[PDB]
Each structure stands twice: as structure tokens, then as C-alpha cells.
RNA sequence: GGGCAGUUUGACUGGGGCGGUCGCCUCCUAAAAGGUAACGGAGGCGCCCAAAGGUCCCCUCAGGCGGGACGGAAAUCCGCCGG
């Protein structure tokens, strides 16, 4: 499904308010997201691989697409890690659908949290991408109250055509990202 | 069944005994071919794998810095540098 509020707030909004912000000379130039990732430090169902199906399966309705997982290559011996086995989520949404779960995001996601304050401003990696972290993931649209057995927290990530953070900060806010000023 | 009989009871070894060692692999000693000794200096082997093998295809690390709900000295993730 290749059209959203999203689709064309960057377009018919954003495309050109970055023009006059920053003035480039190409199309190409101006920043553009391309890369929504989103990932799970699950050291805790290292033992349920039970709890691996539902942070996954849960997942899939609220990233509208299938999850994957990846073991570690040189596990801490000390918190019950050692080679190969263990587990940490991550699904890489691209195209229309990584839209589709940012639209949940900003007007869904956000507007209620346990007292959501804004997003973090220092959370720009110094060049153009942003990551930041969520406890309940049932605050999305799809999740249901009695379904959920634990408080599996994840956090996300968005790469940009961004070069600086300043050029990702105004990215963001053009889209509609709630920054704690 | 030492009453009795025949015998056995290793070598190296700055004397012999005691101690240690005895075959195989790696490095040094070794003097830029090879090979070299010492009771010279140091470490391993007496296994393991049906996937840890064949071939086809695909991808490429460790680490350093920045960023990320548990966790950050080191899980998993995005980024950039990284032969
Ligand atoms: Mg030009
Ligand atoms: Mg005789
Ligand atoms: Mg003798
Ligand atoms: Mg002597
Ligand atoms: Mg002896
Ligand atoms: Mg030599
Ligand atoms: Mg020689
Ligand atoms: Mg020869
Ligand atoms: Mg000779
Ligand atoms: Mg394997
Ligand atoms: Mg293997
Ligand atoms: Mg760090």
C-alpha cells in the first residue's frame, strides 16, 4: 500500500520547508528517512525460547513485518552467555511499510506513555540517525491489555540521508517527532 | 606351598644412588640453505568432528569513537573509522 499521511508529509511539506531551511542545490541532497530498524536486547528469554515466539510474533503486528532473531559470537560467561545460542531480535522495515509503523509512532505510540516527556534531543548519533528507547510495547495500536505476559522492552532506530544532527533534528521535526525541547 | 630350585630386578647420568627424564609436535639455542649438542630456555600430543567433511552460493573481523528500554569496561542493534 504505497500512500500514507506520512507518504506525503515529506513531500508536500517537509520537501521544501528543508529547501528554505538549509538551501541545497539537488533533490537528492536533502534528507530522506530510508532505514527503519528496530531491536530487542532479549538476554532475559535467553532460557523461554517461548518468549522468544511472542516478542516475535507480537512484533509482527506492530512493525507490519516478519521478525528475526540473531545469536551472539562471544557470549558473557558471566551473565549465562557463552557462544552461538543466545538471542537478540531485529527487523530491518524499509519502503512503505516502515512508514506504516512510523505513522503508529508519532500519533499513536507517543501520545500515550506512562508520562512521555519528548524525545530525547541528545539522542543524535552526531551525524544523521536517531535511536531511542521504549519499556511497554503495548502502548501500540494492535497490542491488547490481557495478551501480554511481561514488560519486554526494545528500543528503535531510523537512519537518515542526514549528514549532521542538525539536519536530522530538523528532519524529524518537520515530519513530527514530539522533542523535549 | 622361600622348605627348596632356576632366575629376573633397564638406560641416560659433569662418579654411582636419590630426584628427573625416555616416543611424537611447536619455538628458541642454530652462527640468514639443510643439519647440529647439553640433566640449555620455554609449551603441547596419546584427541576432537557426520558436521567441524564434499561441492555450489553468499556474506567478512577484532577493535576504537558516537548513539541506543534491562544491560555499556564487554550481550544484541544503527552509524563512522577500521587490511
Ligand atoms: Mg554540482
Ligand atoms: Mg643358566
Ligand atoms: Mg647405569
Ligand atoms: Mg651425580
Ligand atoms: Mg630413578
Ligand atoms: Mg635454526
Ligand atoms: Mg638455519
Ligand atoms: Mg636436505
Ligand atoms: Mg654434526
Ligand atoms: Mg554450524
Ligand atoms: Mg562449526
Ligand atoms: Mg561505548
Keep these: 500500500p504505497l500512500d500514507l499521511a506520512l507518504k506525503r508529509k515529506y513531500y508536500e511539506e517537509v520537501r521544501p520547508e528543508l529547501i528554505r531551511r538549509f538551501g541545497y542545490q539537488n533533490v537528492w541532497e536533502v534528507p530522506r528517512l530510508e532505514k527503519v530498524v528496530i531491536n530487542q536486547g532479549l538476554g532475559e528469554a535467553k532460557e523461554d525460547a517461548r518468549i522468544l515466539e511472542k516478542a516475535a510474533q507480537e512484533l509482527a503486528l506492530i512493525t507490519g513485518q516478519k521478525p528475526a532473531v540473531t545469536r551472539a559470537k562471544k ?29 503508529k509512532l508519532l500519533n499513536v505510540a507517543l501520545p500515550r506513555i506512562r508520562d512521555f516527556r519528548g524525545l530525547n534531543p541528545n539522542s543524535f548519533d552526531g551525524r544523521g540517525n ?6 511497554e510495547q503495548l502502548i501500540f495500536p494492535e497490542i491488547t491489555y490481557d495478551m501480554v505476559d ?3 522492552g526494545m528500543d528503535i532506530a531510523v537512519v537518515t540521508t542526514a549528514e549532521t544532527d542538525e539536519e536530522a533534528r530538523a528532519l524529524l521535526e518537520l515530519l513530527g517527532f514530539p522533542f523535549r525541547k
Design 75 to 103: 557470549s558473557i560467561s558471566n551473565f549465562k552467555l557463552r557462544k552461538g545460542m543466545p538471542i537478540g531480535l531485529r527487523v530491518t522495515l524499509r519502503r512503505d511499510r516502515m512508514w506504516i509503523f512510523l505513522e
Design 130 to 135: 536517531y535511536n531511542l528507547g521504549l519499556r
Design 150 to 152: 511481561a514488560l519486554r
